[PDB]
């Protein structure tokens, strides 16, 4: 029974290596990673791989790994797939811990924009969780943390993390992680998966996929939001992605909004992430 080596980048940046039979479905590898992580609330998470075009794809747990990675290396990342709108309702602290690690990467990467004060507050909770109570011994007037807090670090930000860290004395790691999440969950791009697209007129837009629904980021002055309930049907054809928006009370017919994606694979990927979010956040 021939087995393939799998390498998984974990949310703390470490590498997990295991073997699965070469015809294994994605669920097999995911179960091994989740067991390694002592993770029970697995429904929020998944594995990503980089395709032949170098795009992030979700590993479908129901299909063969080899029919997804195809010509590519069996190299994966462990990631949050469905960001819970209310992390306080997760049953386990260890779930909230992995969600914090993902969000720290979302922030450092610039995928999750954040004001100066929120960067410092989030950073202060991470430090409290990771190091415990503020200690002046490790912190002189010139201190710079090993922790990555932001896409661009400044001495002012490092100072503000320390000032807020001082206020968290006696906070336990679970407590600091919960505070981190109560702040992060409110950010306007929390849990938003962004896709480049063009509207029916050829104007460059971004489509965002999240728990609440679909966002079309057009102008800055113009952001259209379609709650999942308002979305009747999702479809793709060639390079195009279509949503069917319900009739408002007393209107005879649904409206169709069409988008042009860069290529057919980008359209299918957007379609699948929308279907999965629609299903997940219809049940939650
Ligand atoms: C942006 C926001 O706060 N909520 C939201 C997002 C997408 C669709 C409908 C919505 O209500």
UniProtKB/Swiss-Prot annotation:
UniProt feature coiled coil, ranges: none
Record's keyword annotation contains Cell membrane: yes
Keyword DNA-binding: no
Example GO BP: protein localization to plasma membrane
GO cellular component: cell junction; cell-cell junction; ciliary basal body; cilium; cytoskeleton; cytosol; glutamatergic synapse; juxtaparanode region of axon
Keywords from the UniProt entry: Acetylation, Actin-binding, Apoptosis, Cell junction, Cell membrane, Cytoplasm, Cytoskeleton, Membrane, Phosphoprotein, Tumor suppressor
Signal sequence annotation: none
Localisation per UniProt entry: Cytoplasm, Cytoskeleton; Cell junction; Cell membrane; Cytoplasm
Domain FERM, first and last residues per copy: 4-284
Cysteines engaged in disulfide bonds, as pairs: none
MF terms in GO: actin binding; cytoskeletal protein-membrane anchor activity; structural constituent of cytoskeleton
Tissue: Expressed at high levels in brain, with lower levels in kidney, intestine, and testis. Detected in lung.
Domain of life according to the entry: Eukaryota
Record note on quaternary structure: Interacts (via FERM domain) with CADM1. Interacts (via FERM domain) with PRMT3; the interaction is direct and inhibits the protein-arginine N-methyltransferase activity of PRMT3. Interacts with PRMT5. Interacts with PRMT6.
Function recorded in the entry: Tumor suppressor that inhibits cell proliferation and promotes apoptosis. Modulates the activity of protein arginine N-methyltransferases, including PRMT3 and PRMT5.
Identification of the protein by name: Band 4.1-like protein 3
Taxonomy of the source species: Eukaryota, Metazoa, Chordata, Craniata, Vertebrata
Residue numbers of the full-length protein present here: 107 to 390 of 1087
């Amino acid at each position: 029974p021939k087995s393939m080596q799998c390498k998984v980048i974990l949310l703390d940046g470490s590498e997990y290596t295991c073997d699965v039979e070469k015809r294994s479905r994605g669920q097999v590898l995911f179960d091994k990673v989740c067991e390694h992580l002592n993770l029970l609330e697995k429904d929020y998470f998944g594995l990503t791989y980089r395709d032949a075009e170098n795009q992030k794809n979700w590993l479908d747990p129901a299909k063969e790994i080899k029919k997804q990675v195809r010509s590519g290396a069996w190299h994966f990342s462990f990631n949050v797939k469905f960001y819970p709108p209310d992390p306080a309702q997760l049953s386990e602290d260890i779930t909230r811990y992995y969600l914090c690690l993902q969000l720290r990467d979302d922030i450092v990467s610039g995928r999750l924009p954040c004001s100066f004060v929120t960067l410092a507050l989030l950073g202060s909770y991470t430090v409290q969780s990771e190091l415990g109570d503020y200690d002046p011994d490790e912190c002189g007037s010139d201190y710079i943390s090993e922790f990555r807090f932001a896409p661009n670090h400044t001495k002012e930000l490092e100072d503000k993390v320390i000032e807020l860290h001082k206020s968290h004395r006696g906070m336990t790691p679970a407590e600091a992680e919960m505070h981190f999440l109560e702040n992060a969950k409110k950010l306007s791009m929390y849990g938003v998966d962004l896709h480049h697209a063009k509207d029916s007129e050829g104007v460059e837009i971004m489509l965002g996929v999240c728990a609440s629904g679909l966002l079309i980021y057009r102008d800055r002055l113009r952001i259209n939001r379609f709650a999942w309930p308002k979305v009747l049907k999702i479809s793709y054809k060639r390079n195009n992605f279509y949503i069917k928006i319900r009739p408002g009370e007393f209107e005879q017919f649904e409206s169709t909004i069409g988008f042009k994606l860069p290529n057919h694979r980008a359209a299918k990927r957007l379609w699948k992430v929308c279907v999965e979010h629609h299903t997940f956040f219809r049940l939650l």
